[PDB]
Amino acid sequence: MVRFTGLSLKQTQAIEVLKGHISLPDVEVAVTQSDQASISIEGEEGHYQLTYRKPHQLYRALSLLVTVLAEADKVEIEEQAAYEDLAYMVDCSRNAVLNVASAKQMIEILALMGYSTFELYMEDTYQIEGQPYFGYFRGAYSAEELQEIEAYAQQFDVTFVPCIQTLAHLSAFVKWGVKEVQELRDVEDILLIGEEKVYDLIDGMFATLSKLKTRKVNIGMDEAHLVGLGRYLILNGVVDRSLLMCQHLERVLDIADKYGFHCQMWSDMFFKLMSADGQYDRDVEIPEETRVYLDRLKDRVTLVYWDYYQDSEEKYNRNFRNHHKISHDLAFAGGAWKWIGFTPHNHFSRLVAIEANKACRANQIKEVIVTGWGDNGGETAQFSILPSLQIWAELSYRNDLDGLSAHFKTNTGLTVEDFMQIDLANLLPDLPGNLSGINPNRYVFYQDILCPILDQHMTPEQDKPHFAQAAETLANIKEKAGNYAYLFETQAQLNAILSSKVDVGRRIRQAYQADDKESLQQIARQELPELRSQIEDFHALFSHQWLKENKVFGLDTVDIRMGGLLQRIKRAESRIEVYLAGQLDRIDELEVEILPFTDFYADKDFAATTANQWHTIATASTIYTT
Amino acid sequence: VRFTGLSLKQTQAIEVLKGHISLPDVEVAVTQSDQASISIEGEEGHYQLTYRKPHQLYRALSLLVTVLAEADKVEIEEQAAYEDLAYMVDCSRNAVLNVASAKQMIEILALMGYSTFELYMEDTYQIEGQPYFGYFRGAYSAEELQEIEAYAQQFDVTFVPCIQTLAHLSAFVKWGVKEVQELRDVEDILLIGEEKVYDLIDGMFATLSKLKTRKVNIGMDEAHLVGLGRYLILNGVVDRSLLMCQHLERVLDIADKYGFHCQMWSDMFFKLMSADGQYDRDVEIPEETRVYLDRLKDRVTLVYWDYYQDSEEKYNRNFRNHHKISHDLAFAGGAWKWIGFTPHNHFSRLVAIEANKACRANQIKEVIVTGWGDNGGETAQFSILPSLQIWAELSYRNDLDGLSAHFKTNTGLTVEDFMQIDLANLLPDLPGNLSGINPNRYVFYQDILCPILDQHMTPEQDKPHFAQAAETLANIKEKAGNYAYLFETQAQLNAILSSKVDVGRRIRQAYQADDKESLQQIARQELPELRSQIEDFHALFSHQWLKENKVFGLDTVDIRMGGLLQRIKRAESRIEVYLAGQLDRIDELEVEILPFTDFYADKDFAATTANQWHTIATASTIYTT
């Protein structure tokens, strides 16, 4: 029933798509572009005037219109967005490659929220002609898929920015034991600077990207910690590593220029190579030769300061001030916390966004890139962080969160507080809320039974009912979550598992020590087989979730991890049985006293911690090393 | 049997060894003599047996039983080429040899002619005040190490711990506590010059000093990035050959404090001082390093290790390279048991014969046979007995003419039957002189839907080879006595491989041909059966492991095999979804398979070397962030 005047055909088609998310009421709306504001909406009694500064801003304007019209007839909206560009970057390199259909849904939602820009982070997960091992069995996007994704974003006047790697974070590529790949290597996950075959590869990266319309790219260059120290050192000897970086940076910028690209890079290696203790968060002594080189290069690249951790504006401001010593062409990357296992932390994301937004505004930052990393196997749902995305959008357009829940429900059908219950498996009640990375969702799940190396981080009196209540809270939200139900069903089941598994290893030890054989038998014969049944159920839900959002490729690692967990539970059953049958004097596993897993949060009152590597969660034995 | 001339200690040791060998009802006069390593004369039921060194009595007895089984008259005289022959067991790759198996190993080593038993322990021995060192790894207590040693002493066999004082400490340094992290340079390497590192090393030697032995191998191999991590950040750039010497001096000073005499792997001197970072190089020694190194080389024996060469002259070249630095050298050879589930006694033989030639020509005094367990310790500890008997024969006789007979006396199997244990590796079109080709492992752990090693499979030959191996090994199991477990495990493995070698390919063929009957059959019959077979193999493997090793470290294999099983279920479920019409394609099967590696791409055969579980099993990330 909605009637619009002043739209192009492109804008009317975009709106039809968006009717799949939002419900437009029966009113008349005159639309025009105007520089007066990012978004303005006025009128009453069913006749409204809507203006946008930039085309893509029509779609957030419509979300605002729908929302405000439910509680009032008169409308006085005026928004002035703080940032020239607000982007969302999805991790497609951690095993989870967003599928094209899910990319389109994400684009639609981002448009409704007010984002200008959609980005995919692809280390090796885009195809390059003549590089058959690059993205092999990883579900690398074809050039056609990226074009499709980008053209879809272009239907909403949302631009596309690929985030690639031109130095390090190429582990999945460089592992292939063929001459054509090994000759490109320096050390660990780092390409060999100065090798012409490496610049042939990088040229090929841009040949693929040049098939897109976009001429904006993030070239990576973060976290190349041993750059110059491997095969580079053997071949070339000791060199000034700050200058090595500039040299490599210059070659890459020249290749980009060849294709007409404008580059951004992560900023951290400048700080780590030019500070005394090799850290990001440092004031730097720039050697003069490097200063002269950076002075040239700074006019050709945007440096991206990334920080997901600080709880105050001042901390951000300090780093911004450090960055100004190098360059005033800066962007900021904030965090949509979805990289700590199975379960996001939209809560923590909200806490730090508020403070990062203050700092970005103070330093006239042109662009914020919200980053959804998927560290260590991509086990968190791609749509798990919609609340964090709306949060950053509200902060840009309105500089407050007053409209957050209403805008969110208009866009998704859920209140933001219901949706943010998705975080529950991380939200142990005794955590302060301002400390990052505390991820019991993941380490309680993948921990062994017989050898429970995180057991000192468990607080069963608190944790068991928290997890138990969370599973019920989430089944209730699932029932009202519409097409988002899958996300909550997955989390409810996980929480149900963690309710019992959080201390099953401890109860086995207490029974063993107390010589309570009836209890060991109960655990071995009833509880553990049921635990496997529940984990299998969870695996089925996870798989459904994964196949909805992502390509099939990379799910294999989760199959392996979860099958291993299941087999280790069976071991706990069988070892207990052998003991019960009188054919073991002792169960040696249980004779070992448990130590703290890590001391990272050892001085806090709470017991939980951060453990975010599957292979160290699951076993104290060797598993990847030789 | 009746002996004269024995001590109480000797008569006690012979009692134990009757558990392995059958002494005939004969009269033997025993005396020490310097005339030969071993001598045996006599006839008509009366024999004279001499030995040079006490432990050599036990080889002599194995010899006597053997020769008497087809002759009344005996004329034996052996002169061993090596002052010491040792076997070193890897107890650091997850598999920690349990005490009961240590005792069986010592007994067999005694019968073969070995003077020395060694255990390689990175973090798998207990250090007071270092609770994370060996944590949940089954680290030997001092009491256990003392027990293993005293048991070896019963046979006049000496004990030498092999430890790590620089790198190869990855299982220790992973632990994210300040007490451990402060000790780190980079990767698996300790931080040279950090006093808490030297506190740790002092603790290592405090544990070992509880032993009687005062001989130790201090490690120091393969510290490739030494100086380039935290060391570089804290201290800046330094001469890495001088850095090495500094650290080596600290370590030898600690050893001296506790009375130890040290050996070390020699590779880092060559790698740090060669231009291309390689071991097999004649190196120019920087002047300051030469001064430092000349001091140090008088305090440590260098161990040249090499397992891979089929020619004497390659060994000799490296001996020459070593002699430019020092003449205080020992040699380490290999009993190949570090390439998965299945050993390579055949390749071990090939290289032993040539290495023995080179060692003799360079007047090497001690040979250490090394039984590494790379990447999870999945090969059985007693899988390499033939390789051990080979080195013993090469030392004492300089040939293998007595090999099978002495082996049979010692184990109950002919050496030919025992070495069938290798079969999962012995693909028919391989030449026998190329190292590391291990289809036993990569055929087993490969995925079904995404078979990244498929190009290395030759089903026309591999399939019957493996099927025929399973039958052969089932026959040998039946005559193998207490070694039956070893063959039973391998028989089941070969049975699995005969179908798994191409199941991934046949799924792909069926899919492309649109042979849905065959996709159904594979999904509903063959793959569930394959899982049942793998579960049985897991059961057999577990039995073997728990018989030979401590329980710790089996968890990794559970994890790995658990994951394989779960991936086979995924193969089944993805095919069913396709068959039900709920996918237009199975994307996994649309990917063209490339060579896994080009390491042996120049050769006529398709097989290769692939010895990392995590890269065998998936092309996705799995340990990286």
Ligand SMILES: C[C@H]1N[C@@H]2[C@@H](O)[C@@H](O)[C@@H](CO)O[C@@H]2S1
């Ligand atoms: C520049 C980026 N490099 C890293 C990225 O790959 C993620 O692992 C992320 C979250 O852990 O941390 C940093 S931010």
Ligand SMILES: C[C@H]1N[C@@H]2[C@@H](O)[C@@H](O)[C@@H](CO)O[C@@H]2S1
């Ligand atoms: C000095 C030793 N270092 C390595 C050892 O740890 C094993 O990995 C072995 C077999 O691959 O290779 C070498 S020999």
